[PDB]
């Protein structure tokens, strides 16, 4: 029973940390998506600038 109690507390803390890291992943994807679309738009414009 005591071993199960440790494992429960560890589960709770670790899965909260998983949610934080996944939110950071989502932010990083939308940074990719903005930079990649605007680079593709620059390629489509074909402007010497």
Binding site for another protein (CB under 8 A): 1, 5, 8, 12, 15-16, 18-19, 22, 37, 41
CB-hemisphere CA count at 13 Å for 46? 1
Q: Choose between 25 and 46: whose C-beta lies nearer to another protein.
A: 25
Locus of tokens 């029973």: 1
Considering the complex, state which of residue 2 and residue 47 has its C-beta at the smaller distance from another protein: 2
* Smallest separation, CB 20 to another protein (Å): 9
- What is the sign, positive or negative, of the torsion defined by CA atoms of 13, 19, 20, 25? positive
């Amino acid at each position: 029973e005591t071993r199960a109690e440790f494992a429960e507390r560890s589960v709770a803390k670790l899965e909260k940390t998983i949610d934080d890291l996944e939110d950071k992943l989502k932010c990083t994807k939308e940074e990719h998506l903005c930079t990649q679309r605007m680079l593709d738009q620059t390629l489509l414009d074909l402007n010497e600038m």
